[PDB]
Each structure stands twice: as structure tokens, then as C-alpha cells.
Design a binder for these strands. Structure first.
Lengths: 140, 206, 64, 142, 61, 63, 104, 140
RNA sequence: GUCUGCUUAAUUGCGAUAACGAACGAGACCUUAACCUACUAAAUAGUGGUGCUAGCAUUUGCUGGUUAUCCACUUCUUAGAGGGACUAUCGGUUUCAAGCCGAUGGAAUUUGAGGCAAUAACAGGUCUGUGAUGCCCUUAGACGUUCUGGGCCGCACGCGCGCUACACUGACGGAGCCAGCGAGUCUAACCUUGGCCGAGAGGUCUUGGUAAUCUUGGAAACUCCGUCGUGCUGGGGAUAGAGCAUUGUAAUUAUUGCUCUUCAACGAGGAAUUCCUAGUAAGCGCAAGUCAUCAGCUUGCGUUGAUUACGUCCCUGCC
């Protein structure tokens, strides 16, 4: 409807989970320069959140940074339907949970090294550097 | 001047527009002609398309390529880049655009500046591969004028295509950025910077 | 998006004859996402008088 | 005198959509913002909204256009192919759910009805409510 | 091509001998006739005999 | 840059290895009775007005 | 005198015994003068079993398309338990199947 | 009485049914009049024939054109043929005879389909190679 | 005989001929796509008329809903019989032979297309389809059988068959919104709607269907109406982090899917080298063949659909 007069609280690069973000990019992404989140947990944490889906990554009230660091990380509460998921049943600690940013990188990790203690064939064929899904790959 | 009063109001805007009149009732094909002697005879100005599609039995008879409406040997080319290959209705929803971005930019009779991107865009003094040996010369000979216009459309399509290609410009703004600068031709275009580049590989070999 | 991008826009886009969104990224350069906005806005008797169709091209133009 | 047919295929869409947006009666089922409609779409509907009030004039104009049909019919219709990616592109039949529930909500007022043979037939109201609202979408064209 | 054949010619060239008189060029009046005379296989074959004949009476005159 | 527009009369015989060349007379339209015998490259007929800025090379029959 | 509206449903592989039987059919029944229709004549099914020619990969890739083309063919006919039976017994034949899907 | 006479349509697949009777104005295609075309760029295909002649003539002549077969552009000539077809089936059975000759020298000029439907076939396919005259790869 | 020549898709045919007349091949024949306002019938196809009827007009009109309200129809749509085209009709063109152009009528390049496919074979392939099978070997620490686990998916790389893309002639989105080839549950779980629950992926109640009777009339390229504006982007979708689901005794060398973010090359492809003359080249889909699933293949179809010749022996190749 117009060019919106963005004052500077347009602030021009952003930081969400230590893990970089850019600040005049159209949001749902930006939440996608991340691990473990991608335009589907992202278009829920914005609908269960009081959001814009067309705002940028710099243009962020902060009451919409800390509620959007927050649903994330929680999972079951602002209706997160649990099929929606990756840490689908822990199976070591159940649980209904989300594997995140720094954390999908050290849990990718801790799922291989409950089946390399074993000595089986879902994390021994990851072990020879060659693939486990059953195929003949030679070409690649 | 007499609105038919048929329930079904089939237009009084496209009834006074195409009753008074023939031709595509945006551009009037009505005091628009060709200015060269050679490319009259071999470039239809227009049998009436009242849109810019004929089945099209144009290659059985070795000639009629001629009888072929220019506008619909154009949409014809574009037909590519392979992925579209087949799509004519994307290629007339694009040249039904082109004729508005020439009218709008110049203020012309744009279906004429469509025709002046024909005769000007044609390579006359052209080469051929004399066989000849391992190496010989491209005896330099002026195409008939038949062939010429085959090239004059062919050329234009391989340079206003790269221009959308990682481009902010949607072929509607590069096609009309080629024909205005290809008739003024100029060399901000691609024909008059290959057409000339084939004259200019011949003028020697010759 | 700051306030010598919309008033460079409106004093430059009344008699500015041929326009689009490839027209505001090549002339006013940054954006596009936004641009199809501060053009279209209004449509006050003094912005653009069009022969524009659908989505897919928006070919606008001169009030007069 | 004044038809549903005599009028276009997205003005009736957006001018029953802002009729069934502004009716309140319409009910709005609980997996109708999130959940992906269709499974080859990644994107659910870009409205997230009262696609439900744009699927409430589609469905509905779509019935009346024919006799009868639905939910495994509006199942072959709303989707398209598949995005299989690498695998030469493939049809996928939606999710009977949302319109198995607008078809039991339209059942409510007197717009859509259950055609004997059975499954969705618009009632006798219903049609009354589409020839009232194809003549109120003919005057945004007139 | 369009190049004629023996079985055909040598069937019109035998015919053309006797029946020059019934003989014509409206070939659609020979076609009929060319059955009452020959004892032909086919419909196609027959339409290619008289075609040739009419290529005799159109040059004979 | 002087352009002499010459009309084709008699299309003669096919040439070249690959049949890329017809031979060609030509009647000078703009000096009728001159009737030179150049070459050209195309799928030709009699009456293809033909275009030469090279007035004149008169050409000889190319494998 | 109990009336019955029979329906006569035929099929073969020869267009020449078969046509024979609704000439005989509908004129060994208009002799009887019966209330009937005329030989309805049903979409031509028409099986093309692709098969390669060779006995062994070798050998070019070198194929066939043999098939049965039936001409499906049906009829009608009223008449009691007496004069549909004298009609079904008569047309009697090589190549052909007759059903009497009865309509009591 | 009714005065009705009447026709078909045929371009590569389907048909129409021009029930060209005596009424007041109408031109119903598919249960949807022609202002309402269908693939709405070609839209001008059918718009030539009402004016290619007097929108004068078709006030008298009422066409409920039902449209089956034959992807959207197939039938476009099939419903074009049929308004002309009968243009001369009205102008043959009903409106005289030189009104079929004044016409067909108008309607013969685009000298196109309009009147005479297309001839061309799809070629049968074969064995080996994929649209039609294609032969499988080659070796050595 | 089986040939100088001219002739063709063709030892296909006129003609030349101590050579006369026949067999197989080819062609004839069979499949399917076209055409029949003539026949033969259709509440598993659809018409009007008929009400019952739901709206706009009120002008009688216009828009409907109704597997029976009745009937009447059979263009339609199916499909049996059937017919129908022969290059036909003049005109040329030629040994005025076989043939070949062109224009009229026509639905209509061998009508299009496949399928059958002699003569002689090749030591091409195959005992890893066989309870078809020679002769060697194996016969219980078997190379026979079977429960498990991994293995044929292992990569610095060499070679083919392929998918998306280098754009504004496109990517995203509403709003228009369109076929054809199939298939399908029985002794049991194949198709599933509908109506709900799920953002979604789905879950399910319950439904019909041994099928022109159900899912099934709604597929994509597109017209719509625009945002994006020459920004490797708002082309590109690589590789990644998690979750949530949907099958599967087993999901690890994540079978697939969703949910959101990580945003890899490549800015039109060298020496090479294919396939193609008409609904033909090619792209947008989908139903089957696998199958519990997992298609970037195999087959088959249509919906949009043109360039370019419609000719040669320069080449290869083979006669």
C-alpha cells in the first residue's frame, strides 16, 4: 500500500541461537538461515505467534525476536502436534521434542554414537564412509 | 452507430470497435506497409489476425512459408530454451505484450516497427560452405531473399533471450529493447553487433 | 526503504511515461520485493494512468 | 433476468468467498489453518484463512456445476500432480477431511444437500442463495 | 510417384484396342464401364486402369 | 554504399557438394538488358528480386 | 398365454456366419410378426498380444499384434413359453454364442 | 412448427450441437455463453465468424451449443465451424440459397478450417523409440 | 529365366527378350484411428416435453434441483451389422507404356500406423525361466537348504542412459479452472469418497463399488488479476539441523512424506556427436508394469503444438 516510513529500530542485521541472520532480506527464512527449522515449523511459530509473514528480519518489537527465541527449543504448548517432528521418540529419554540449531549438530551426532556401541547395520554401513539405504551407488 | 440489442450483451466495446472496420482491434495492418524492394512478396502486410492462430499447413507446399503471417513466423523461433518447446499460448498471451511496450516506447505504428525490424535486420551479402578441401572459401554468395528473412527472425531470437537470463527484464522489455534498437538498426541490439559480424566476413573470401 | 526512496518515486512517476518493477530496479535500484506497492499505491488525480495484465506482466504508464 | 454461468469463474469465488468471510454461523473446523490441505504440495494454502472462505464458493457453483459426487471424487480435483524431484514428475488425490466438512457445514443452513443415489446436489434455498448472489457479482461486472 | 505399372498399362492397352467405340475422357463414365467389359481384381486397381486408359483418348484426338 | 538491385531470370542448375548452392542468370532491374551469371544460397525461384551491393563478380562455377 | 420380453446376446470372430444369424434372426421373427428391435451393433471389443518374435536378447529390438476382433453384437423379442423356445431352439451353427437373458 | 434447424461440430478430437431455433438474442456454450469465453487468451477465436457479417443476423438465430472430448484448445475450431456450418445449415434449410453465396464468399477468405474441418492425423507409433519418427540410440 | 532401360516403399510393374508360364517373400490379408442426421436398442449413454420445483425477471421470460413424476425420443455417447476410397474427375506431364505433378470434389505421404515377415544362416546370446537338457562334478564338516545379521547402496576417479535450471517469453501467489490410456475388493482388505479430527503429512469413522453402476466429470502447461524489477535475485533448491507423521518382525549404510531454516554449483555447456518430414519435434502432466512400500526408468495416452525439406549420392552403411 506504500513505502513505510523503514526510522531505525529499522536495525540492519539480526541476532535467532548464535546461529548468523541477515536484516533487510521476507522473514519465514531470514527464522531456515538455521539448522533444524525450515518453512514448516517456521509457518507455525509465526501463526501460533503474533507475527508478520511479510516483515523482514531486522524489523523486530523484541517482546517477536524472545517469543519467536522461545513454541522452538516447549514444543508441546502453543499447539505443536508432535508427526510434525524429526526428535520423534528419543528412545534412549519417550520424548515429544525439537532438535534445534547448535543441537541438531550434537544430537545429526549422539544418535550414531546408541548404534555404534552395538556391533549393527543401520550405523555400520556413517561408519565405512559408503550407503546404508540399500542401493548400488558406484556412479554418484 | 447502432448498438446490436440481442440476456446476452456480447459487447458494445468489441461489437464500436470491430463491426465500425478488419484486423486485431488494438492495432490498426490499415495504412501500414513495407518500404523496401526484395522481402515485398516474402513477408505477408497482413491477412487479419480479427488473433495473433492458423491449424498451419505451412510446410508440405516447398514455399508457402512465404502466406504465413510474420507475426504468427514469430510466436514462430521464440518456440524454445527446449523446456517451453511446444508452448505457443505462453509465446501469445509475450508478443501480444511486445506490441504494446514498441506502441508505448517511440509512439509509433508498432505493427510497422515490427515490420521495419525485418527490412534492415536481413543479412544480404552472405557466405556458404564450397566441400572446398580441408580449408577453402565461404564462396561468398546474396542468399534467395527467401532464406534472407528466415535468418532475420531466427538472429533476433538468440540475443533478446539472454537479455530474461539472470535478468530483471521479463522478452515482452528486451525483445521491445531490441526492435526499436534493431531497425535505427543501431548495435545496442544483436543483429546489426551479427548481421553486419557475416556482411563483414564476406567482404574479403569474396 | 528510507525517506529518499519514496520522494525521489513520486516527483521524478506522474509524467514518467513507461514503467514497471524492472523500471524501479534499473532507475528509483534495491528492493523489487515491495515494488508491484509504491508504484499502484494512488491509481488525488496525479500518479499513473495505465494500459497494464494478471499477476503475468504489469506493463503501467501519463493524469494526462 | 439473471444467472451461475451468465457470470465469471472468480467474481461470484471472491464476492461468495466476503458474503460465507462475513456470515458467521460460517462453522470453522479445527485443522483449518495449519496441517497441509494437499501430500504433493511443502506449502499449505498461502492464505491460512477464512481457503477454508475461498473454498466455500468453489465445491459450494461446482455442484448445483453438475448433478452429484462427494469424497474420493473433491479428492481427484484439488491437488494436481506431484513434485517427486529427481523420478519423473507424477496425479495425487488431497485429504477427504475439510470438504468430508464443508461437507457437513454448508448441511447446516440450506445451501448444499445430500443427493439420493448418496453424497453431494445444492438444495431447492441453496441454488435461491446462488442465482441472490450471482446477481448482486454480475453488478460488479455491470 | 505419381509411376504407372504393367499389371496396369498393358490391361488399358489391351482394352483400348477393341473398345475405342458404348468410348471416353466425365473418366467417371469409363470407370463404371470398365467393369462390364474387364473381369477385374480390385476397387483401387480399377481406378488406376481408367485414370491410365484417360491419358489415351486425352491425347489420341 | 551503392546498392544495385538485380532481378533473377533463369534458374540454371544445382551445385555445391551439399546442394547449398543454386546456379543463377540476372536481369538488372535498376538497366534491363545486361544479363550477366552469379551464385546464391537458398531454397530459389524465378523472380527472386535479388540483392547485390557488388555490382559484377562477373562469377564462375564450386565440390 | 403368458408374455415375456426376451433379449437376444451374440458374439463371434467372423462378420460371415454372424451377420447371417440377424438376417435369418429378425426374419425368422417377423415371419412371427416379433412386439422387438433391430440388430444392435456393440462397440468393437479387441486383444493385441505385444510379443518379441525371437526365441533368444538375441538380435534386434523385432516385435509382433495378433488379435481377436469380435463383432460384440444384440436383439429383442415378446412371445409366451411356446413361441420363444418353437426360435432361442432354432438360430440352428458354427462360430457363435446365444444367451437368452429372460425378462419374465 | 419448431423453425429447429441444425448441426454438429468436429479439430483432432471432439464435437458441438447447433439447436438453432427461433427466440430472442442468445449463444450458450458449455452452459456458459461464448462474453464468458473459457481459455481467455484465444478468446478471439470464436469472436470472428456475430459482428465476419451482421451480433442483425444472430438476433433471430438462437444457438444453445453443447460442448463435449479432446488440454483446452482442441474444441475451439470444432465451436467455430459450428456457428458458420450452421450460418449455412440457417442459411441453407431456412434463409434462401444466394444467402449461402452472397457467404461461404465471406467465410471463404480466411480460407481456413471456419467451414472445412482439419484433415491431418496423429501418426501411429513404433517399435523402437519414443513423439513419432524417433529411433532408439546408437553404438560401436 | 533373375535382363540395357524407364518405373516404384519394393525382382513394384511395362517394355527389351531362346526363353514360356508358376511357388514362396512384398503386396494382398488381420489390428486400431477417422465418416455414416440411413438402419438396431438402451433407469449401468442422453434429449425435448413434463410436473414436483429452488433463485433472478416479472414480459410470456431467464437461471436451476429431480436414478422415474411421467412418458416420448436415440443427433448425440456407446456399438453391432453394415457400407464407403479407387489416387477419382478434366488438365497437363511421358516410349502420350508403367508412372508423376496440380486443382475440384472430398470425412479421408501404403487412407495413418503397426503385427505377420521367405531364402540361407551366426559356432552372436542364453543349461542364472524351466520338473526342456547332455557329459563332467557335487551327496550330510554337500556347492542341498534355513534361521539370523551384514553384502550386491562401500570411493581420488574413466565411460554411457537421464532429471530440474542459468530467468520478467520467469518465479512466487490468489482466480479462472480443462482430457485420454487404466485399474479394483473374495473368500479379505483393492478402491476409498462422503462427514468430522490434523497448519500439514494424515487419522479415521463409516460409506459405496467384483464395476459405462462407486472412488471417477474438476491432471498439469494456461487464461485470469497482480506482486516481484535487472539486485547469482523474488533465477538456482545443493547440502544440511531437528522434529512430526505414514507404511514396514526389522527402518541404522534417515523407504517416503511433510513441517520451518542451513541457500551448494551454474550465468546457455569444448573435442565429439546423436536423432526426426506432420498432430510430425519437443514439454506439461497422468493411469498401468513393478509393488508392502521407494521412479529421476518401462509402456501407453491425450491436451497445446511449430520450424525445416518433401531432395540428393559429398559421405558412411549396405545392396
Amino acid at each position: 500500500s506504500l513505502v513505510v516510513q523503514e526510522q531505525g529500530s529499522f536495525q540492519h542485521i539480526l541476532r535467532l541461537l548464535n546461529t548468523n541472520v541477515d536484516g533487510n532480506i521476507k522473514i519465514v527464512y531470514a527464522l531456515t538461515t538455521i539448522k533444524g527449522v525450515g518453512r514448516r515449523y517456521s509457518n507455525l511459530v509465526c501463526k501460533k505467534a503474533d507475527v508478520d509473514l511479510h516483515k523482514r528480519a531486522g524489523e523486530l518489537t523484541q517482546e517477536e525476536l524472545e517469543r519467536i527465541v522461545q513454541i522452538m527449543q516447549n514444543p508441546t504448548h502453543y499447539k505443536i502436534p508432535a508427526w510434525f517432528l524429526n526428535r520423534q521418540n528419543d528412545i534412549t529419554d519417550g520424548k515429544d521434542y525439537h532438535t534445534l540449531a547448535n543441537n541438531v549438530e550434537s544430537k545429526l551426532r549422539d544418535d550414531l554414537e546408541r548404534l555404534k556401541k552395538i556391533r549393527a547395520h543401520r550405523g555400520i554401513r556413517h561408519f565405512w564412509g559408503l550407503r546404508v539405504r540399500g542401493q548400488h551407488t558406484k556412479t554418484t | 452507430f447502432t448498438p446490436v440489442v440481442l440476456a446476452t450483451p456480447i459487447p458494445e466495446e468489441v461489437q464500436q470497435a470491430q463491426t465500425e472496420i478488419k484486423l486485431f482491434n488494438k492495432w490498426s495492418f490499415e495504412e501500414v506497409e513495407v518500404k523496401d524492394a526484395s522481402l515485398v512478396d516474402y513477408v505477408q502486410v497482413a491477412q487479419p489476425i480479427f488473433v495473433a492462430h492458423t491449424a498451419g499447413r505451412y510446410a508440405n507446399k516447398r514455399f508457402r512459408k512465404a502466406q504465413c503471417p510474420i507475426i504468427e513466423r514469430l510466436t514462430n523461433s521464440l518456440m524454445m530454451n527446449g523446456r517451453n518447446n511446444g508452448k505457443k499460448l505462453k509465446a501469445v498471451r509475450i508478443i501480444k505484450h511486445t506490441l504494446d511496450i514498441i506502441n508505448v516506447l517511440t509512439d509509433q505504428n508498432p505493427i510497422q516497427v515490427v515490420v521495419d525490424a525485418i527490412t534492415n535486420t536481413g543479412p544480404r551479402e552472405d557466405t556458404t560452405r564450397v566441400g572446398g578441401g580441408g580449408a577453402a572459401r565461404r564462396q561468398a554468395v546474396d542468399v534467395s531473399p527467401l532464406r534472407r528473412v528466415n535468418q532475420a527472425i531466427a538472429l533476433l531470437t538468440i540475443g533478446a533471450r539472454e537479455a530474461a537470463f539472470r535478468n530483471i527484464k521479463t522478452i515482452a522489455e528486451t525483445l521491445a529493447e531490441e526492435l526499436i534498437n534493431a531497425a535505427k538498426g543501431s548495435s545496442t541490439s544483436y543483429a546489426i553487433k551479427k548481421k553486419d559480424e557475416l556482411e563483414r566476413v564476406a567482404k574479403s573470401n569474396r | 526503504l528510507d525517506q529518499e526512496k519514496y520522494d525521489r518515486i513520486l516527483k521524478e512517476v506522474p509524467t514518467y511515461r513507461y514503467v514497471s518493477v524492472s523500471v524501479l530496479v534499473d532507475r528509483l535500484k534495491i528492493g523489487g520485493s515491495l515494488a508491484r506497492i509504491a508504484l499502484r499505491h494512488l491509481e488525488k488525480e496525479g500518479i499513473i494512468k495505465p494500459v497494464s495484465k494478471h499477476s503475468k506482466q504489469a506493463i503501467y504508464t501519463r493524469a494526462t | 433476468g439473471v444467472s451461475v454461468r451468465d457470470v465469471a469463474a472468480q467474481d461470484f469465488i471472491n464476492a461468495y468467498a466476503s458474503f460465507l468471510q462475513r456470515q458467521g454461523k460460517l462453522e470453522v473446523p479445527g485443522y483449518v489453518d495449519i496441517v497441509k490441505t494437499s501430500s504433493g504440495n511443502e506449502m499449505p494454502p498461502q492464505d491460512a484463512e477464512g481457503w477454508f472462505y475461498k473454498r466455500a464458493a468453489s465445491v459450494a457453483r461446482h455442484i448445483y456445476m453438475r448433478k452429484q459426487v462427494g469424497v474420493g471424487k473433491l479428492n481427484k480435483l484439488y491437488g494436481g500432480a506431484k513434485s517427486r524431484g529427481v523420478r519423473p514428475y507424477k496425479h495425487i488425490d488431497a485429504s477427504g477431511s475439510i470438504n468430508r466438512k464443508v461437507l457437513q457445514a454448508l448441511e447446516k443452513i440450506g445451501i448444499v444437500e445430500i443427493s439420493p443415489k448418496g453424497g453431494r446436489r445444492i438444495s431447492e434455498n441453496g441454488q435461491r442463495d446462488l442465482d441472490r448472489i450471482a446477481a448482486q457479482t454480475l453488478e460488479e461486472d455491470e | 510417384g505419381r509411376v504407372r505399372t504393367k499389371t496396369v498399362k498393358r490391361a488399358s492397352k489391351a482394352l483400348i484396342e477393341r473398345y475405342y467405340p458404348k468410348l471416353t475422357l466425365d473418366f467417371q463414365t469409363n470407370k463404371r464401364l470398365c467393369d462390364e467389359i474387364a473381369t477385374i481384381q480390385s476397387k483401387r486397381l480399377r481406378n488406376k486402369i481408367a485414370g491410365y486408359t484417360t491419358h489415351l483418348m486425352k491425347r489420341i484426338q | 554504399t551503392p546498392v544495385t538491385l538485380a532481378k533473377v531470370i533463369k534458374v540454371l542448375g544445382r551445385t555445391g557438394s551439399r546442394g547449398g548452392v543454386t546456379q543463377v542468370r540476372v536481369e538488372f532491374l535498376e538497366d534491363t538488358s545486361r544479363t550477366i551469371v552469379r551464385n546464391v544460397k537458398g531454397p530459389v525461384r524465378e523472380n527472386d528480386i535479388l540483392v547485390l551491393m557488388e555490382s559484377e563478380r562477373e562469377a564462375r562455377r564450386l565440390r | 398365454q403368458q408374455i415375456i420380453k426376451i433379449r437376444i446376446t451374440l458374439t463371434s470372430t467372423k462378420v460371415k456366419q454372424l451377420e447371417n444369424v440377424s438376417s435369418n434372426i429378425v426374419k425368422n421373427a417377423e415371419q412371427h410378426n416379433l412386439v422387438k428391435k433391430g440388430p444392435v451393433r456393440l462397440p468393437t471389443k479387441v486383444l493385441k498380444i505385444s510379443t518379441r518374435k525371437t526365441p533368444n536378447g538375441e538380435g534386434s529390438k523385432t516385435w509382433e499384434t495378433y488379435e481377436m476382433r469380435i463383432h460384440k453384437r444384440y436383439i429383442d423379442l415378446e412371445a409366451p413359453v411356446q413361441i420363444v423356445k418353437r426360435i432361442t431352439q432354432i438360430t440352428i451353427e458354427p462360430g457363435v454364442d446365444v444367451e437368452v437373458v429372460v425378462a419374465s | 412448427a419448431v423453425p429447429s434447424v441444425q448441426t454438429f461440430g468436429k479439430k483432432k478430437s471432439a464435437t458441438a450441437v447447433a439447436h438453432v431455433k427461433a427466440g430472442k438474442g442468445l449463444i450458450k456454450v458449455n452452459g456458459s455463453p461464448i462474453t464468458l469465453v473459457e481459455p481467455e487468451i484465444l478468446a478471439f477465436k470464436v469472436y470472428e465468424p456475430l459482428l465476419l457479417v451482421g451480433l442483425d443476423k444472430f438476433s433471430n438465430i438462437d444457438i444453445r451449443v453443447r460442448v463435449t472430448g479432446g488440454g483446452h484448445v482442441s474444441q475451439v475450431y470444432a465451436i467455430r465451424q459450428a456457428i458458420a456450418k450452421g450460418l449455412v445449415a440457417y442459411h441453407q434449410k431456412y434463409v434462401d440459397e444466394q444467402s449461402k453465396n452472397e457467404l461461404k464468399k465471406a467465410f471463404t477468405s480466411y480460407d481456413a478450417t471456419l467451414l472445412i474441418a482439419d484433415s491431418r492425423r496423429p501418426e501411429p507409433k513404433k517399435f523402437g523409440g519414443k513423439g513419432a519418427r524417433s529411433r532408439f540410440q546408437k553404438s560401436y
